[PDB]
Structure formats: structure tokens, C-alpha cells
């Protein structure tokens, strides 16, 4: 009735080292290294914080500012009050392009500084958790106002570029700033706590699995429940499904190296420091005159009259196990996490991007389950290979601000 | 500033570095594993370290089997460069007992019953052909570099991508130096030229908007 | 015990001088005069 079992066993200490590649390493391990990419989750923080800044609905505030922009352009062009047909088409495009460069300057700078905050979360640990084990330890730290207070002064410094002087131009530009003032302080505080330590901390077995730091307990989040036998715990993991063939490749490679180093001497019979790549052939042969390298002694102890003898040659099948594993891990990430590669003509492989199916498997529980992040929205499929210039360009056409400008532009036509 | 493979680093809860008499601040992008016995890093070279060591030791093994099989006649007992030298001048210098025979003394109390011969067998170049495909899959998946390829699958020089510019030039610009106003480069600008950069930025600049505003009033 | 992929060739051959790796003993107990013999491969 104890109900406790150790998680860091002899199996689990070897599972984390497979990714680290000390024991066995092949070409198929590299496709897991693209699964550890934090830049796709970095795109989710860029889309979320930019969309809600452009989600403010202020109809009368937008239409009142074009009137003051029109009244400014009346004084800049004197003696042209009689004509007004050419006045519309030049100043309307002149009104729209002013508002893009102000959002290019101040709005995008606040997004990237939250995105690249020093030592807060770890997506590379999270892929190192989930692929190895279904459990994700959660250490909740205190939300510290160290990087937060550096942002809260830049809340004022976003206004200091306009210096609160242009109330007409600012009342759109601060309305999108006063929403991102509140949202960053709500997002960055939730961006702090969640931490874990891969291959360091300790985990136990009960009805609900528990983890522990030096003196405190650690909450455990499980995405895939392993099998718990009373003798030995077997995980439901893609590496655990690979563990038989990973062990078999290194032992036959050490067997292959053993047969190489045993067949060094050219003459085998019965009885009954300078690097050689750098050394000259004249200097090497003076050092190779040793009885260990030239002969193999086979003593054959007494009471033994040798009747016959045979010779055995070099035969490990070395590279056939390596060529299987490169096709084996290639079929693993493309079917467990369903990654879609891009392929040029004549079947040439390029870098593998993510898919819509892996963004529900990984970035679903990474965003929603780990941290209490309610308002977050999942990324569309075509945005994973895009650029930061391409993201803010496409989101403008579906934003709130473009609807108001199109409403103004179709009345005057 | 920093000094690669020169300065000194320690291990604590927060990692610290040191110059001759002053402390050096340490910025960490990937946290390694800290075991009490041996420290194992989370590095792409550290993930390669097993196969890098195995290639040189079997190449030194391959060179050892070459230099052991020099003499053409092997039996039991029981300075001018040769590329530059003439064949008549070389054979006068090759009349040496070390190059012609291999002595195998077989010490006393040993009546040799049988004997065998072993030939040259290292698998030399198969380890080298694996590593060229191994590092090719490493930078294209850890840093996600996009190459350009002509027809019939011919490889050209590999440019950067949008994914490596967040991994490398993100922490290089923002984390290291307090550079607030810096903006990350667009994707299509990495292969451009300096004439092409200033041409394209003019069409989205502030100055072109004012000139277009003047040019549409008079039309 | 050092892994042969990591070990030097000079350090390995000092450890490979063992009677188990070099020979196979086939005792063929008494009352048996061996007439012929054969070899089987992989």
C-alpha cells in the first residue's frame, strides 16, 4: 500500500541521452531538432499581440481625424478653394500612408521586446519533454516586476514619440497603445511562471503523478498516459517505440569496430606518439617495428594436439542498420507529428516546415494547458513559413482599421 | 566583446565568467544539462561528438593498416621525395632491410603448427560519405537554412532564411546590446544588393509619399 | 572498460590481448579420432 515508483530508472536516464546522441546517433535525429523550433510559437505571440491592438472599434474617432487632416491640407494649398475634385484622390492616399508608418515605428517595437524576454519560458525543453515522456513538470515561480517595470516606462515612452502633443493624430495611435498597454502587462505576467528542468528534477508514481523540487512539490501535466506495470514502467513515447532498434545499432557498431581492431596483424599463426596521418612514412615504420602489431600469439595450452585449423574473415553488416534508421525516423516525425516537407523537382528534399496537425498536438497544450492563456488564438496553416513583414501586411486587410478607411473611401468614391 | 576558447567560465545557479581581474556577464540562449559528475551540453556539435570521434579513429586505423602492409614479402622466423626523384635514384635508396622484409621472431618454446594471412580491410570512405549527408541535414534543420538549387539537382551557395534570422540575429541584436529601435530584416532582403535595398525602401519611405502628393494635385 | 569507438587504437590493442577473443577452443572429448572437418560461414 505504498503506491510509489521511481521515474528516473535505468531506462529513463537513457531516453534523454538519445536526443543528446552520446550512445547512438543517426541522420534521423536531425528532424527532431526542427521539431524543437521555438520560432513558430514566436509567430503566435506576434499575431496575437498585433491583432488585438488592431481590434479596437472606434468609429467616430477615426472619422473625426480625417476632418482635421483635411483642414490642415487646406492651409498648405492656398488659392485652390474653387476646385475640389483633385483634392480628394491625392489626400486620401496621403491620409492612409501616414497611419502605416506610425504603426510601423512604435507598435512593432513593443511586440518583439516581449517576444525576446530574458529567461522566461523554454519551448526547447517542452519538445524534450513530450517526445520523451507524456509528463510535463510545471514549476510556478513568482511573477517578478523586473522586466515588467522596464516595459511600464516604455508604456509612457510609446506616447513620448508623439509627446502627447498631436491629440488629433494620437487619439487613434494611443487608443491602439492603451489596449496594448493593458494586454502586455496581462500577457508578460503570465509569461513568467511556468518553468521545468529536463533530466534534473524527480518524479514519482501514484494515481496522479507528482514531481518535486528540493523542498517543494511540482505539478505534473500529462498529455499521453504511460503504461504502469507493477514490475517495470513502459512509456507511450515515440522514442520508447524506437528504443529496441537504437540499442541494436550501437552494439553491432561496437561489434563492427571490434572485428576491425582484432584483424590488424597481417600474419596469424598457431603456437601450441605522432599521428599517422601527420607522420612521414620513414618516421612511422621506425615506430611500427613492434611485436604486437606484427603477430598474434595463440598459445593453445598443454594437453592439446591440434588436429585442424581454419580462418575467419571480416563480416559484420555495418551500414545496413544505419540506412534503415534514416528511413525509420523519417517515417516517425512525418506520421506521429505529421510534418509536411517541401520538395523541389527530381525528388530533392528541403527543410521541413510545420503543419496544421502538429500545431494542435504541440502548440495547443503548450499555450492553453501549461499557462492560463485564455484569449490566445491558434495560428493559421499558411502563416508558418511567412515572414514578419508578410504577417503584418496580411493582417491589415482583415483588421478593424481597414474597414473604417474603406468606409470613408467609398462615400466620396 | 568576448574571447572564444580563451576566457574562463564557472558553474552556479546563474553561470558566471571571468577575465584576469573582473567578472564577465554570461548570456544563455540554450541551457545545458548539469550533472554532478559530467556536464553535457545542448549543442548541435555536442549532438555530433560521437560520430566525429569515431571517424578519425577509424581513419588512423585505416592509415595504420596501410603502413603495416608495405613490405611485399612476409615470412616467419621461429632524403629526396619519391614524386620528384628518378626511378634509378630511388631504387638505390630503397635497398634497405626494413622496406623489403618483416621479421616475426616467434620466441622460444613455440613450435609453429599452422599460419594464416590477413589482408587490407578497413571500410575507409563509408564513414566520410555519411558525415557529408549528416551535417547537410544538421544546419538545414537546426537553423533551417534554405538553399537555392538549379536544374538537375545542382547545389549552389546556401543563403539564410526567415527562421535563422530569429534564432541568430534576434538574440545577437536585442539580447547582447541594448538596441531598442532595431527592426528585423524581411525575408527577401538577404540575397539583395545595396543598390537594390535603397531602391526598394524609397518606394515605402516618407519622402515618396510627399512627392506623390505634389504630383497628383497638378496631375 | 572503454568504448572502442572512443578508444585509441594503441589503447585498444593492449586490452584486446585476451584468449577469448583470439581463439575458439573445441575440446572434442575422448574416444573420438577425428576423421575429417569442415568450415561453415555466415
TrEMBL record, chain A:
This is Core gene UL6 family protein. InterPro entries: Herpes_Portal (IPR002660). One of its GO terms (cellular component) is virion component. GO terms for biological process: chromosome organization. HAMAP family: HSV_PORTL. Keywords: Coiled coil, Host nucleus, Viral genome packaging, Viral release from host cell, Virion. It comes from the Viruses. Pfam families: Herpes_UL6.
Amino acid at each position: 500500500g505504498s503506491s510509489i515508483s521511481v521515474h528516473p530508472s535505468e531506462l529513463s536516464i537513457s531516453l534523454f541521452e538519445i536526443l543528446q546522441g552520446k550512445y547512438s546517433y543517426v541522420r534521423g535525429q536531425t528532424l527532431h531538432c526542427s521539431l524543437r523550433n521555438p520560432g513558430v510559437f514566436f509567430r503566435q505571440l506576434f499575431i496575437h499581440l498585433y491583432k488585438n491592438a488592431l481590434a479596437n472599434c472606434s468609429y467616430d474617432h477615426v472619422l473625426s481625424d480625417w476632418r482635421t487632416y483635411e483642414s490642415s491640407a487646406k492651409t498648405r494649398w492656398p488659392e485652390k478653394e474653387a476646385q475640389w475634385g483633385s483634392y480628394r484622390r491625392s489626400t486620401f492616399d496621403s491620409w492612409a500612408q501616414t497611419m502605416r508608418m506610425t504603426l510601423d515605428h512604435l507598435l512593432l517595437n513593443a511586440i518583439n521586446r516581449v517576444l525576446y524576454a530574458k529567461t522566461q519560458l523554454s519551448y526547447e525543453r517542452y519538445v524534450d519533454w513530450v517526445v520523451t515522456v507524456g509528463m510535463v513538470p510545471v514549476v510556478k515561480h513568482t511573477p517578478d516586476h523586473k522586466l515588467v517595470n522596464s516595459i511600464q516606462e516604455q508604456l509612457m515612452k510609446d506616447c513620448q514619440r508623439l509627446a502627447s502633443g498631436e491629440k488629433t493624430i494620437g487619439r487613434i495611435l494611443t487608443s491602439v497603445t492603451q489596449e496594448i498597454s493593458n494586454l502586455v502587462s496581462s500577457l508578460s505576467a503570465l509569461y513568467i511562471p511556468g518553468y521545468s528542468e529536463v533530466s534534473i528534477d524527480y518524479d514519482c508514481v501514484k494515481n496522479t503523478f507528482v514531481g518535486l523540487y528540493k523542498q517543494k512539490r511540482v505539478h505534473v501535466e500529462v498529455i499521453t498516459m504511460p503504461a504502469i506495470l507493477a514490475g517495470r514502467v513502459i512509456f507511450d513515447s515515440p522514442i520508447q517505440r524506437m528504443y529496441t532498434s537504437i540499442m541494436s545499432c550501437h552494439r553491432t557498431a561496437e561489434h563492427a569496430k571490434l572485428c576491425q581492431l582484432l584483424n590488424t596483424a597481417p600474419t596469424k599463426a598457431l603456437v601450441g606518439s605522432v599521428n599517422l596521418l601527420t607522420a612521414n612514412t620513414f618516421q612511422s615504420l621506425g615506430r611500427l617495428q613492434d611485436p604486437s602489431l606484427q603477430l598474434t600469439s595463440s598459445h593453445i595450452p598443454s594437453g592439446s594436439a591440434v588436429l585442424n585449423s581454419f580462418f575467419s574473415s571480416y563480416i559484420p553488416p555495418v551500414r545496413e542498420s544505419m540506412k534503415d534508421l534514416t528511413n525509420l525516423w523519417e517515417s516517425e516525425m512525418f506520421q506521429t507529428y505529421k510534418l509536411a516537407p517541401v520538395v523541389d523537382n527530381q525528388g530533392q528534399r528541403l527543410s521541413v516546415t510545420y503543419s496544421q496537425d502538429t500545431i494542435s498536438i504541440l502548440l495547443g497544450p503548450f499555450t492553453y494547458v501549461i499557462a492560463d492563456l485564455l484569449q490566445m488564438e491558434l495560428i493559421s496553416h499558411s502563416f508558418v513559413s511567412s515572414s514578419l513583414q508578410d504577417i503584418a501586411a496580411y493582417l491589415y486587410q482583415t483588421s478593424r482599421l481597414f474597414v473604417y478607411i474603406t468606409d470613408v473611401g467609398q462615400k466620396y468614391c
